[PDB]
Design a binder for these strands. Structure first.
Ligand SMILES: C/C=C\C=C\[C@@H]1O[C@](O)([C@H](CC)C(=O)NC/C=C/C=C(\C)[C@@H](OC)[C@@H](C)[C@@H]2O[C@H](/C=C/C=C/C=C(\C)C(=O)c3c(O)cc[nH]c3=O)[C@H](O)[C@@H]2O)[C@H](O)[C@H](O)C1(C)C
Ligand SMILES: Nc1nc2c(ncn2[C@@H]2O[C@H](COP(=O)(O)OP(=O)(O)NP(=O)(O)O)[C@@H](O)[C@H]2O)c(=O)[nH]1
Ligand SMILES: OC[C@H]1O[C@@](CO)(O[C@H]2O[C@H](CO)[C@@H](O)[C@H](O)[C@H]2O)[C@@H](O)[C@@H]1O
Ligand SMILES: [Mg+2]
Length: 393
RNA sequence: GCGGAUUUAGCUCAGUUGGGAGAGCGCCAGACUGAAGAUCUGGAGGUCCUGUGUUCGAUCCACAGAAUUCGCACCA
């Protein structure tokens, strides 16, 4: 691309989660179109956010989609998540790399299944801040109903351990705004206003080696194969050398581009979801889950001893013990992989709540350094949290 | 990113929509012939692709995965 994208303001990437059918995907367009005037950016519409045909006919958002917009004191990378239960896995990854998250909730219904699920999955993945947004207020005029719901969204949040009280809550309507009624456009800003007031500023690594967990791959007709993702740390000056590590046989490549939302760039510093060019690599040779990095700073692995805390039921985990052979999915950065457990001579079972040292063996090698944290989800819910104590590979 | 379909002995394939699995061939024997092969007669041989949940009990259900494949989408 030939634009340029010139730095200014810190770059905070955020997004939308929350129950289905109420807000998320339309609020996104709103923010982008509102702000494309109240701060003059460049907006897009629903038709453009849920661009995928299945999303159009099914009317439901299946895969996250990225979108950008500018405030005056920050830069925003926005990711729209799918509320449908069938896709949590899809949003999990999107949220996992979020600086803060707008939890959209409809005034009318209020807390629903997919709303608890997301908030919990939030708290469980990284995400440090949530800004609740009561939506569809243009469907409820009973200043006392809102009181009721808000008073219950909070109680919820703070149940998974969030601020809740100190938690900001805008009151507006997406399509209203998106359409034009300025009495609401204003509300879009009262939110777009807290993404700065509340952030607060993200610490970026930079003082370390390059590494970017891949999370999406494209094949630009004009250029070559592209991979996107949130730079974990360091920087990649275009023209540098990279290694596509893990899952498949390690591959060597040289950067050949680094865009930031269709706008050319020369580098990509920690915290910016950006694209890369990697020359010589075709689409069918690289995939999500793999990490791009400074050659020789990270090798792939299969077997490793770990120290894991198996959450209890009271934390939404198993309620029945597991034994040798249990093989759930271990989540590493931008993916997961089934690996098998092997308990210690001198341990026959693991009860939810217990802590355990167990040696895992994934069905696929993965970029991992001793100490790397990972999560374990199985048959639908997060089974436990742990860390790579000692690689054995 | 989203959907279908198939996985049952070494090979080819039936079977059960929860009660604890077969044929043929090929494999190991005794039988006939100097012996091959044919063929007769006997046995051995399955984690029913994997893990969980439910259950008194799961090869079949549920929830999570794998390998083949066959279609769709998307495009810094
Ligand atoms: C979560 C998915 C992928 C995670 C991947 C990786 O996780 C991580 O490894 C992470 C590191 C700790 C990890 O391992 N996460 C893995 C796990 C981490 C878990 C941590 C921290 C917890 O403490 C024990 C923490 C949430 C704790 O739980 C409490 C939750 C109680 C819930 C009760 C729910 C109950 C009865 C319930 O019926 C219920 C519900 O209400 C809503 C939805 N459904 C339910 O069924 C409370 O909210 C506390 O806050 C890193 O973040 C990595 O970088 C990562 C993001 C790549
Ligand atoms: N009255 C009213 N309707 C709204 C409002 N916001 C969205 N809607 C409508 O309700 C539906 C919700 O669509 P959408 O925003 O994509 O839902 P979502 O929250 O992203 N759910 P999912 O992404 O899981 O499909 C649409 O028909 C939309 O136009 C609002 O504030 N008021
Ligand atoms: O073409 C718009 C594009 O410009 C960038 C940098 O290339 O930012 C500039 O324009 C924004 C819109 O008003 C300003 O908020 C920003 O301060 C200014 O540098 C991109 O951020 C934007 O996508
Ligand atoms: Mg949507």
């Amino acid at each position: 691309a030939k634009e340029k994208f010139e730095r200014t303001k810190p770059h905070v990437n955020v997004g939308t989660i929350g129950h289905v059918d109420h807000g998320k995907t339309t609020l996104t367009a709103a923010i982008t179109t509102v702000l494309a005037k109240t701060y003059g950016g460049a907006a897009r519409a629903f038709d453009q956010i849920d661009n995928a045909p299945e999303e159009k006919a099914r009317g439901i958002t299946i895969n996250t989609s990225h979108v950008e917009y500018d405030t005056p004191t920050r830069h925003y990378a926005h990711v729209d998540c799918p509320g449908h239960a069938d896709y949590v896995k899809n949003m999990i990854t999107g949220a996992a790399q979020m600086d803060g998250a707008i939890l959209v909730v409809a005034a009318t219904d209020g807390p629903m299944p997919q709303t608890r699920e997301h908030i919990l999955l939030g708290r469980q993945v990284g995400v440090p801040y949530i800004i609740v947004f009561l939506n569809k207020c243009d469907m409820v005029d009973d200043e006392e109903l809102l009181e009721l719901v808000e008073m219950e969204v909070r109680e919820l949040l703070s149940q998974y351990d969030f601020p809740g009280d100190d938690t900001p809550i805008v009151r507006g309507s997406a399509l209203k705004a998106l359409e034009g009624d300025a009495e609401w456009e204003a509300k879009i800003l009262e939110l777009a206003g807290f993404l700065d007031s509340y952030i607060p500023e993200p610490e970026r690594a930079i003082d370390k080696p390059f590494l970017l967990p891949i999370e999406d791959v494209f094949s630009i007709s004009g250029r070559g194969t592209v991979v996107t993702g949130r730079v974990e740390r360091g920087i990649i000056k275009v023209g540098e050398e990279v290694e596509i590590v893990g899952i498949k046989e390690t591959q060597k490549s040289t950067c050949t581009g680094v865009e930031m939302f269709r706008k050319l760039l020369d580098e990509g510093r920690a915290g910016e979801n950006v694209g890369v060019l990697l020359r010589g690599i075709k689409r069918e040779e690289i995939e999500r889950g793999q990490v791009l990095a400074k050659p020789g700073t990270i090798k792939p692995h299969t077997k490793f001893e770990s120290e894991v805390y198996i959450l209890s039921k009271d934390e939404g985990g198993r309620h029945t013990p597991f034994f040798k052979g249990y093989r759930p999915q271990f989540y590493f950065r931008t993916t997961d992989v089934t690996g098998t457990i092997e308990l210690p001579e001198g341990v026959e079972m693991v009860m939810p709540g217990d802590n355990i040292k167990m040696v895992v063996t994934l069905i696929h090698p993965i970029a991992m350094d001793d100490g790397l944290r990972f999560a374990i989800r199985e048959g639908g819910r997060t089974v436990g949290a742990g860390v790579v104590a000692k690689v054995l590979s």
